[PDB]
């Protein structure tokens, strides 16, 4: 695929999407190299691995990685592959490790992923420099509890990568001086669909909630104004209803809805965010940090999407709560969140059903031969909005989705971060 060919697959000025961005194997190879190999990717929350030794597996594309707390409180993320002959260093999902030992030929690593010992070194590997034969290390940075990782040294730091999107992330992460914590337990499941459907939905698709997808999910728990952020650059996006507690009550119940809009804790969030609207009038926010980190401030599910070829993803989801929230509220977030946005949840059940059918249809030649309609709300933007940074539209728009797919083009057509950095305004 020539760079010129890739840029035609997506047009943000007319609003077309060529459906082969979802199906083509060569494009997907290139995504792993040019997107996943140099994007910042959600690894978890700091409170998942609090003590030294504590580790959890995760993924960067289809590269398996270890996320481990160090003696000094730092977090290292390194490839879960031994450089001798490629064996996975650790087969457990998590725990507390004293060290790691490769099960094939006994190459031993410390908790930082350093190669510290090799059986029969003095006779069999005389030249060997163990400090150079450790698994590839990724850069690891944090923002308000969330752990992100990135292979590429030429990438901007987390804080820059997130950019103006910090503002919208803060609606969930910066509501109190205590910060957030993760409820323990991470749900994983397999949905046969392309990752760009999921990322897009959480980036831009309040329209799917506002219509037919979740009728039945709303009924199980028994929406007019709103805006949509679209990052000036970087492919991030968030949407949210304003004013009406309606929708949140039917998703999360009255306890959570009250907690989100009323009483000490909610007024605290309006203060730190400098706005009664942000802290107390925001309802059912969705967001994506490009490419594959997504979350719903309010409901407080967060997850990473892991690609598994063009026709499949894994979803790794968990729930964050205010660290200082009463114990009874943490318990309510736990239940309501698994009741709704999980594999068996009354909302998300139905997303997995939809996305799976879209992908199956695209086996067809004619189904990949005409573009999808990405034209919702074209032109109806405002990049000069006094209270909300970035490119703002009505909450029913695919402007953020256009920017997600434009970012996809920029990454897919940039040999390195220099070239990509050269695509900004």
């Amino acid at each position: 695929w020539a760079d010129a060919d890739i840029a035609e697959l997506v047009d943000e000025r007319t609003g077309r999407l060529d459906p082969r961005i979802y199906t083509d194997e060569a494009l997907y190879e290139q995504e792993l190299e040019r997107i996943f190999g140099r994007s910042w990717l959600l690894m978890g929350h700091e409170t998942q691995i609090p003590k030294a030794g504590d580790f959890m597996t995760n993924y960067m594309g289809e590269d398996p990685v270890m996320v481990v707390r160090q003696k000094n409180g730092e977090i290292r993320v390194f490839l879960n592959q031994c450089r001798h002959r490629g064996m996975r260093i650790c087969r457990a999902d998590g725990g507390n490790a004293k060290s790691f030992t490769c099960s094939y030929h006994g190459w031993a690593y410390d908790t930082g992923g350093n190669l510290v010992s090799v059986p029969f070194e003095e006779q069999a590997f005389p030249g060997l420099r163990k400090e150079d034969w450790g698994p590839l290390q990724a850069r690891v940075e944090t923002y308000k509890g969330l752990i992100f990782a990135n292979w590429d040294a030429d990438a901007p730091d987390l804080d820059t990568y997130l950019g103006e999107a910090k503002f919208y992330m803060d609606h969930m992460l910066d509501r109190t001086e205590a910060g957030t914590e993760a409820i323990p337990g991470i749900q994983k499941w397999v949905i046969p669909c392309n990752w760009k459907f999921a990322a897009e939905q959480f980036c831009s698709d309040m329209y799917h909630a506002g219509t037919t997808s979740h009728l039945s999910g709303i009924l199980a728990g028994l929406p007019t104004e709103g805006i949509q952020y679209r990052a000036t650059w970087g492919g991030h996006g968030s949407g949210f209803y304003i004013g009406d507690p309606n929708l949140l009550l039917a998703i999360m119940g009255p306890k959570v809805t009250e907690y989100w809009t009323q009483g000490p804790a909610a007024e605290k969030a309006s203060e730190r965010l400098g706005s009664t609207e942000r802290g107390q009038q925001l309802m059912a926010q969705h967001m994506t940090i490009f490419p594959t980190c997504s979350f719903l401030p309010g409901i407080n599910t967060i997850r990473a999407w892991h690609p598994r070829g063009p026709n499949e993803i894994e979803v790794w989801a968990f729930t964050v709560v205010d660290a200082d929230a009463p114990e009874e509220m943490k318990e309510e977030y736990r239940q309501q969140t698994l009741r709704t946005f999980s594999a068996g949840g009354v909302f998300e059940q139905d997303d997995g059903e939809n996305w799976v059918e879209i992908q199956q249809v695209l086996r067809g030649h004619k189904a990949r031969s005409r573009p999808f309609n990405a034209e919702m709300g074209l032109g109806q933007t405002d990049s000069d909005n006094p209270d909300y940074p970035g490119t703002i539209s009505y909450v029913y728009s695919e402007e953020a989705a256009r920017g997600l797919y434009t970012q996809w083009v920029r990454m897919m057509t940039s040999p390195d971060w220099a070239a990509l950095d050269a695509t900004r305004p």
């Binding site: 087969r91 999902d93 337990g185 749900q187 949905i191 039945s216 009741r339 999980s342 059940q349």
Partner: protein, 177 residues
């Protein structure tokens, strides 16, 4: 079930088996109004998340009480799920999947209060939907069944589904174990 269960009368075995076999029919034939009618008002329908652990840490193999789970529902939550699944806009089950609950290995121990019964059984759940989707599950269900005057004979007071999967091999969990 810390030790082998004391033998029970074969008529109790047969009564409880028939209760599970009738349960299975209810679920597989989509008689969800009748199935939910089996749940006691103190129902705890729990399905913990399972992880892969080294032998020395298998204690953390299952998520515990205040941790995330596939299911962790009370009577109010399940009623919501019934209201969802009996609607013409519940897309994961309209069109409806075809399920089969093949139950076996039923072992019965007497509960603390009389009329109550600790039960262990295994299952295969075979779930087929649309044109060619096929999800096959297995596990254990540790129940507390409670005696009752209804035609069914019992109400499900508690249920812990231990699923033999780490990562769930399904796009959703839109049916009931």
């Amino acid at each position: 079930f810390r030790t082998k269960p004391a033998p029970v009368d074969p008529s109790l075995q047969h009564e409880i088996e028939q209760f599970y076999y009738w349960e299975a029919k209810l679920l597989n034939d989509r008689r969800f109004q009748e199935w939910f009618d089996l749940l006691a008002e103190d129902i705890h329908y729990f399905m913990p998340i399972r992880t892969t652990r080294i032998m020395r840490e298998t204690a953390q193999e299952y998520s515990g009480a205040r941790e995330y789970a596939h299911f962790d529902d009370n009577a109010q939550m399940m009623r919501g799920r019934l209201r969802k699944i009996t609607s013409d806009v519940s897309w994961s089950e309209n069109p409806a999947s075809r399920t089969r609950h093949v139950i076996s290995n039923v072992m019965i121990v007497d509960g603390e209060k009389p009329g109550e019964y600790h039960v262990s059984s295994v299952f295969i759940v075979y779930r087929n939907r649309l044109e060619r989707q096929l999800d096959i599950f297995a596990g254990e269900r540790k129940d507390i069944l409670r005696r009752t005057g209804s035609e069914a004979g019992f109400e499900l007071a508690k249920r812990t589904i231990l699923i033999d999967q780490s990562t769930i091999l399904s796009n959703n969990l839109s049916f009931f174990f």
